[PDB]
Paper text:
The main protease (Mpro) of the betacoronavirus [name]-[name]-2 is an attractive target for the development of treatments for COVID-19. Starting from crystal structures of the Mpro in complexes with the Hepatitis C virus NS3/4A protease inhibitors boceprevir and telaprevir, we optimized the potency of the alpha-ketoamide boceprevir against the Mpro by replacing its P1 cyclobutyl moiety by a γ-lactam as a glutamine surrogate. In line with our original goal of identifying broad-spectrum inhibitors that target the main protease of coronaviruses and the 3C protease of enteroviruses, we also assessed the inhibitory potency of MG-78 against the Mpro of the alphacoronavirus HCoV NL63 and the 3Cpros of enterovirus A71 (EV-A71) and [name] ([name]). Finally, coronavirus Mpros feature a catalytic dyad comprising a Cys…His pair, whereas enterovirus 3Cpros have a catalytic triad consisting of Cys…His…Glu(Asp).
Using 10 µM Dabcyl-KEALFQ↓GPPQFE(-Edans)-NH2 (↓ indicates the cleavage site) as a FRET substrate, we found IC50 values for MG-78 of 6.7 ± 2.2 μM against the EV-A71 3Cpro and 1.45 ± 0.40 μM against [name] 3Cpro. Crystals of the EV-A71 3Cpro complex with MG-78 were grown in cubic space group P432 and yielded useful diffraction data extending to a Bragg spacing of 2.07 Å, whereas the [name] 3Cpro complex gave crystals in space group C2 that diffracted to 1.65 Å. Compound MG-78 binds along the substrate-binding cleft in both proteases. Similar to the situation in the coronavirus Mpro, the nucleophilic attack of the catalytic residue (here Cys147) onto the α-keto group of the α-ketoamide warhead leads to the formation of a thiohemiketal, with a covalent bond between the sulfur of the catalytic Cys and the α-carbon. The amide oxygen of the warhead accepts hydrogen bonds from the Gly145, Gln146, and Cys147 amides of the oxyanion hole. The carbonyl of the γ-lactam accepts hydrogen bonds from His161 Nε2 and the side-chain hydroxyl of Thr142. In the [name] 3Cpro structure, the contacts to Leu127 and Gly128 are more relaxed. Instead, there is a rather short distance to the Arg39 guanidinium group. The two nitrogens of the P4/P3 urea unit donate hydrogen bonds to the oxygen of Gly164 in the EV-A71 structure, whereas in the [name] protease, only one of these is strong enough to be called a hydrogen bond. Whereas the crystal structure of MG-78 in complex with the [name]-[name]-2 Mpro revealed an ideal fit, those of the complexes with [name] 3Cpro and EV-A71 3Cpro demonstrated some steric incompatibilities that likely reduce the inhibitory potency. Such incompatibilities are more serious in the case of the EV-A71 3Cpro compared to the [name] 3Cpro complex, in remarkable correlation with the inhibitory activities of MG-78 against the two proteases.
Numbering used by the authors: 1 to 180
The structure:
């Protein structure tokens, strides 16, 4: 209830639809002109953001201290408008909740909200054959079209949807220290 209300407002204010050469994704703006995509969006020097051409000033593919994959790409966007600063809503470590909402904003799943239930700290996963850490797990059969999906609870942005195995979905944890 409060989680759906939080998610609708979060997506209204900070989400957009992005097309890269590698497909269509939900993109979350974090602060200033920094957004996050799943790494496998592989954003070029230019992106479509809500059907408009936008330049990518910088692109950091995130890895932990061992160089392990986190499956997140931070993007600096060449635009005048700035994102509402949502770093306050990002945890310092992986959040587990009994009740989460996954919010999608593409052409395929426009403004849809999925109650995914319990989110558990999964940690390690071989994702696309790349070892990956900091994975949050929910028992939902996620499909193509949901990557970049934003995983939320009341007052919390928990992570970005990056993968599934047909029965479970996995989000990369969106941790505060990524955006210092
Ligand atoms: C996402 O890009 C999208 N278009 O929505 C997509 C979401 C997937 C597709 C089917 N279910 C989902 O939630 N993500 C991917 O395709 C990522 C991408 C490539 C592989 N990948 C996967 O999620 C794969 N899973 C996987 O590696 N399976 C394990 C090994 C964990 C058993 C797969 C096989 C495409 C579903 C990369 C770069 C991680």
């Amino acid at each position: 209830g409060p989680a759906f209300e939080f998610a609708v407002a979060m997506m209204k204010r900070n989400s957009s639809t992005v097309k890269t050469e590698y497909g269509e994704f939900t993109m979350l703006g974090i602060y200033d002109r920094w957004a996050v995509l799943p790494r496998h969006a592989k954003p070029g020097p230019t992106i479509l953001m809500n059907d408009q051409e936008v330049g990518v000033l910088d692109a950091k593919e995130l890895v932990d201290k061992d160089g392990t994959n986190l499956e997140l790409t931070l993007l600096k966007l060449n635009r005048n408008e700035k994102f509402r600063d949502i770093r306050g809503f990002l945890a310092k470590e992986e959040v587990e909740v009994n009740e989460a909402v996954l919010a999608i904003n593409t052409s395929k799943f426009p403004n849809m909200y999925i109650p995914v239930g319990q989110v558990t700290e999964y940690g390690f996963l071989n994702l696309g054959g790349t070892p990956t850490k900091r994975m949050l797990m929910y028992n939902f059969p996620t499909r193509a079209g949901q990557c970049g999906g934003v995983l939320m609870s009341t007052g919390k942005v928990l992570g970005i949807h990056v993968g599934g195995n047909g029965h479970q979905g996995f989000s990369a944890a969106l941790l505060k220290h990524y955006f210092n």
